[PDB]
Amino acid sequence: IANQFNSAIGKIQDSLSSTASALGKLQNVVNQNAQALNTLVKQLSSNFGAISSVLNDILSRLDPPEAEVQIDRLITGRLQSLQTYVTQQLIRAAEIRASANLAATKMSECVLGQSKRVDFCGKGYHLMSFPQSAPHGVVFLHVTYVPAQEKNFTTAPAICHDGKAHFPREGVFVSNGTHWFVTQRNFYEPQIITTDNTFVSGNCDVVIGIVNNTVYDPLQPELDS
Amino acid sequence: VSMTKTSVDCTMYICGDSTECSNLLLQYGSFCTQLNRALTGIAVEQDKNTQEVFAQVKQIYKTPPIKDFGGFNFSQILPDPSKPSKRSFIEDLLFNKVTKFNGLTVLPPLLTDEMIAQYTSALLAGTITSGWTFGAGAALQIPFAMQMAYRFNGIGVTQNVLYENQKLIANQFNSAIGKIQDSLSSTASALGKLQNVVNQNAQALNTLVKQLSSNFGAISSVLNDILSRLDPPEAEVQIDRLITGRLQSLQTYVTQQLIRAAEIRASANLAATKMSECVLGQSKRVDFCGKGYHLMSFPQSAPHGVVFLHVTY
Amino acid sequence: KNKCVNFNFNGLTGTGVLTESNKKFLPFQQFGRDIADTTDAVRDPQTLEILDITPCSFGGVSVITPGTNTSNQVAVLYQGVNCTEVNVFQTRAGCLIGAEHVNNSYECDIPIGAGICASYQTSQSIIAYTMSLGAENSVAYSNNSIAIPTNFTISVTTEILP
Numbered sequence: 001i002a003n004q005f006n007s008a009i010g011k012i013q014d015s016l017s018s019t020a021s022a023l024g025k026l027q028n029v030v031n032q033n034a035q036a037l038n039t040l041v042k043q044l045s046s047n048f049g050a051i052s053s054v055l056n057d058i059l060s061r062l063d064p065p066e067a068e069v070q071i072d073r074l075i076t077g078r079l080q081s082l083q084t085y086v087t088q089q090l091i092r093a094a095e096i097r098a099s100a101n102l103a104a105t106k107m108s109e110c111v112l113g114q115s116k117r118v119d120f121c122g123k124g125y126h127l128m129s130f131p132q133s134a135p136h137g138v139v140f141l142h143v144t145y146v147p148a149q150e151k152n153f154t155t156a157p158a159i160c161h162d163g164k165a166h167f168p169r170e171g172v173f174v175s176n177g178t179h180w181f182v183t184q185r186n187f188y189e190p191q192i193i194t195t196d197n198t199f200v201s202g203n204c205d206v207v208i209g210i211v212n213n214t215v216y217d218p219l220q221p222e223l224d225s
Numbered sequence: 226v227s228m229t230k231t232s233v234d235c236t237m238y239i240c241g242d243s244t245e246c247s248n249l250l251l252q253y254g255s256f257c258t259q260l261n262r263a264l265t266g267i268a269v270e271q272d273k274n275t276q277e278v279f280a281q282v283k284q285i286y287k288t289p290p291i292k293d294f295g296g297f298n299f300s301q302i303l304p305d306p307s308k309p310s311k312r313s314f315i316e317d318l319l320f321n322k323v324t325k326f327n328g329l330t331v332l333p334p335l336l337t338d339e340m341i342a343q344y345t346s347a348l349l350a351g352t353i354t355s356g357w358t359f360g361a362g363a364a365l366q367i368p369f370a371m372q373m374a375y376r377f378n379g380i381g382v383t384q385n386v387l388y389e390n391q392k393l394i395a396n397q398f399n400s401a402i403g404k405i406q407d408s409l410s411s412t413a414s415a416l417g418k419l420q421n422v423v424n425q426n427a428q429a430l431n432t433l434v435k436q437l438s439s440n441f442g443a444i445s446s447v448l449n450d451i452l453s454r455l456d457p458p459e460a461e462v463q464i465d466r467l468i469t470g471r472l473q474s475l476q477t478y479v480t481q482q483l484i485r486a487a488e489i490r491a492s493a494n495l496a497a498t499k500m501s502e503c504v505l506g507q508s509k510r511v512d513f514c515g516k517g518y519h520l521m522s523f524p525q526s527a528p529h530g531v532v533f534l535h536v537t538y
Numbered sequence: 539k540n541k542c543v544n545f546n547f548n549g550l551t552g553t554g555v556l557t558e559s560n561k562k563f564l565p566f567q568q569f570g571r572d573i574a575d576t577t578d579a580v581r582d583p584q585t586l587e588i589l590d591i592t593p594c595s596f597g598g599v600s601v602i603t604p605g606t607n608t609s610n611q612v613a614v615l616y617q618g619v620n621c622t623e624v625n626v627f628q629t630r631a632g633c634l635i636g637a638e639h640v641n642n643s644y645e646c647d648i649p650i651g652a653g654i655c656a657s658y659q660t661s662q663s664i665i666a667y668t669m670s671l672g673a674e675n676s677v678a679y680s681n682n683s684i685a686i687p688t689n690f691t692i693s694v695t696t697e698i699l700p
Contacts, residue, residue: 001692008694015696025698039255046254049465077253084259084476091483096700098491103699118506119281120498122695124361140697146362147687155684157371157388167384172371174684185375188688201385208295208391209370209681232598242553272649280671287676295681325574326554326593330618333631333651340653343671354679364677365685434574449551 005143012141026137032092040085048077103138107131110140125186147186156180159193160204161215168198180213192216226278226493227334227529228486229426230268233478234328235260238437239471241327243448249461250468256476263479267486272335274493278531279336279344281500282359286350294353295370296395301402302523302534304346312342312526318409319527322416323423327434341526348504348524356521360505373520379507380518380538398536405534419530425485433478441470496531500524503535542594548583552591556580559590595619597632602648604658613637613664615650627666629654634666643670 016022047053050070051062058067110121110129121129122142132139153174159166171182174190181190182197191197194216204210235257240246250257288303304311312320320338351359356372358365370391374384387394409415440446443463444455451460503514503522514522515535523534545552549568561579563570570579581588597618604611613636616623621633628634631651646655646669655669 004692005694008692012694012696022696023698026700029700039259043254047252048254049249049252081254084256087480088263088483091487094487095490099700106697106699116509117502118357118360119501122693122697124693134698137698137700140699142695142697144693144695146691146693147365147689148363148691149687149689150363150365150685151688152366152678153684153686154682155368155371156682157374165388167388172684174686183686186687187690188686201383202389207388234596234598237596283672285672285674287674289676289679291679293679293681325572326576326596328596330597332617335646335649335651335653337653340671347671350676354677364675365687366677366679366683367685368679368681368683370681371684431574434576438575 009141023134026135029096029136033089036085036088040081043078043081046077048073050074106140107138110142151188156209156211158204158207158210159198159213159215160210161213163203164200165202165204165207165210166193166198166200166215169196171197180211194218226274226489226496226531227271228267228422228482228489229529230271230332230334231426231430231482232261232264232268232330232332233433233475234330235472235475237328238433238475239468241448243452245452245457245460246448246464246468249464253468253472256472260475260479263483267482268332270486270490274490275334275336275341277497278493278500279341279526281497281505282344282347282351284347284359284364285343286347286354286359286364288350288353295368296391297369298399298402299349299353299523301406302525303349304342310342311339311346315406315409315525315532316342316345316527318406319416319525319532322409322413323419323528325434327437329430329433338526345524345526348500352504352521352523357506360501376507376520377538379509380520382518382538402534416527419527422489422529426482429478429481433474436471436474439470441466443467499533500531503533539589545580545591547580550577550580552577554591554593556589556591559588561588561590563588595622602634602637602650602656602664604648604664608658609662611636611658611662611664613656613666617651629666637664637666639666641667643668645670 045053050073051058053074055071055074058070061067062070106121106129109115109117110126111131114128115121115126120126121140122144124144124146127143127145129143130141132141153176155175156173157167159173159180168182171184173193174181174183176190180193182193183190193213196218198215236247236250240250292299301314304313304316351364353369354366355364356367356375358367370388373394374387377384377387438446443451443466445451445463446467448464448467451463454460455463499514499522502508502510503519504524507521508514508519513519514533515537517537520536520538522536525532525534539557540555542555543553545554545556547568559579561570563579563581568581568583569577572578577591579588579590595618597616600615600617602613602615613634615629615632615634617632619632621628621635624633624635625638626633626635627637627639629650629652631654634650634654637656644655644657644667647657649655649669650666653668654666656664656666658664
């Protein structure tokens with residue numbers, strides 16, 4: 001796992017250093033804010049139905065009672081240009097706020113602990129996470145356990161030893177074709193059946209799919225002491 | 226999950242094919258260009274809201290021909306292959322209980338109704354045949370009678386009660402799925418969350434069109450009745466009032482639809498969370514994946530939304 | 539009929555496409571209206587016949603281009619209009635020109651609409667196809683079989699958040 005982990009960190013340097021589009025979520029933030037300001041300054045060049053966009057070309061050209069009308073159109077146009085800017089930024093801040101409340105939920109649930117939420121702190125069975133700062137954001141490195149190599153087995157919900165039904169305490173029964181074994185659901189670690197791995201409930205004439213096999217008592221060979 | 230994608234030509238709505246109007250509109254700045262960018266940005270989000278919800282898995286799964294699920298009948302949930310539209314009997318009810326030329330044009334969705342069901346069926350076949358494993362890597366075969374034995378252990382119930390009472394669990398389940406049909410077919414108010422999403426949009430569109438007939442203080446709401454009636458320097462005054470009024474009616478529509486896309490983007494991010502913690506797994510969050518101790522969930526599509534079927538103990 | 543023209547009637551004016559339909563008007567009527575106070579039908583003042591009014595086709599124009607570092611070959615999509623002005627293919631979103639349709643399904647590289655997606659692939663050109671949703675991996679199922687992993691792998695993915 002140490003070589004698997006250290007090898008994976010090396011891939012992060014290759015992905016971040018080669019593909020610059022990985023941070024598209026953060027570059028779209030600064031770009032949208034820049035388009036707004038650039039569009040806000042372009043509005044100053046518009047006339048909005050007036051004689052000219054410049055105030056000096058109206059005050060030093062026209063009389064008071066006629067300039068006050070042309071001046072009013074620029075104000076009414078430039079004022080609405082601000083309301084459209086402030087209105088959008090209030091909406092953009094709501095999206096960034098929802099993203100921060102999420103990132104705080106992940107820094108507490110993923111980093112400061114272990115998350116049992118599926119596909120929240122990364123795809124797979126979550127072990128830990130490692131934050132890395134970034135401009136106007138965060139970067140989480142979610143470590144995950146992923147089983148890869150599989151093998152088909154034959155299973156059963158229970159085992160009948162002498163009239164009593166035996167269910168497993170932790171894990172599931174399997175079979176290599178000839179013998180029955182207990183094994184953890186997420187990793188093949190076969191073990192022999194015994195009273196410590198299983199528990200009894202009921203009888204064999206009820207459960208569906210039950211089979212017949214021997215349940216080993218550890219105190220049996222001790223009788224030959 | 227999603228909204229009706231729309232886009233509005235800010236030139237034809239205000240200036241209905243008039244050379245004099247477009248010349249005056251050119252002096253108002255980039256209000257026209259900004260409005261198209263907002264709606265264009267909204268319509269793109271409505272395609273992400275479906276990928277983040279339905280496309281939780283890249284690998285497609287299918288049920289086996291022998292539907293031996295341990296007494297559980299999923300026929301009303303699984304798709305009907307004999308139909309032309311590969312949707313289940315329950316999806317047929319949801320797609321039936323849920324019921325212009327001034328520059329307004331409705332863009333279509335990226336994924337079609339037949340594409341959504343291919344995802345919704347893939348998640349059912351995985352939850353049935355594999356359970357919680359296909360949401361964490363390669364799918365692992367686990368029978369259904371053994372799935373619930375683990376899901377019963379996850380809620381503080383030993384797995385003796387299941388195997389001893391499989392006949393009761395399977396009858397309670399199938400009996401409950403039947404009530405969902407009767408409830409959806411009888412009560413129309415079940416799909417109210419999705420019907421308001423459509424009516425709220427049409428109210429804004431119809432109001433957008435009714436604002437064209439208003440005069441906004443001018444002699445009339447029609448351009449032909451102004452350019453063909455008054456002199457050039459006088460028509461420019463009356464036309465300037467309509468352009469200022471029709472333009473304020475667009476900003477009110479965009480500002481509303483830009484807020485509604487936040488309420489929908491917050492609901493889609495929830496449904497994506499429910500399609501992961503409840504469907505691809507077993508949740509310990511109380512009343513999140515249904516009232517009671519959670520066992521599993523089964524999604525079903527709908528027009529502009531989802532419908533979960535939360536099994537609880 | 540079936541041509542974008544202008545309208546100058548006794549009690550109606552406008553611009554659009556005129557065509558016969560099955561609408562029925564009153565004895566003293568000259569023109570109808572739709573739900574939103576917009577005309578969509580009219581009767582001939584001289585003959586007894588009612589002709590619907592479909593406005594002339596309009597729709598946004600968009601280009602399907604790969605990166606400029608790859609090629610200058612470009613296709614065009616006329617959104618929401620059948621093929622009028624026209625390597626042509628009609629979709630449920632519009633008349634796509636400059637792209638050759640293929641029956642093979644692939645992943646969506648450049649979205650278009652209605653399940654259609656484009657891509658620059660091999661003598662290279664732009665293609666249009668119905669996007670695939672992944673390969674089928676219908677797994678085995680039976681009342682007695684189980685899959686148990688024998689190895690694992692430690693993945694370290696990445697997540698960006700503004």
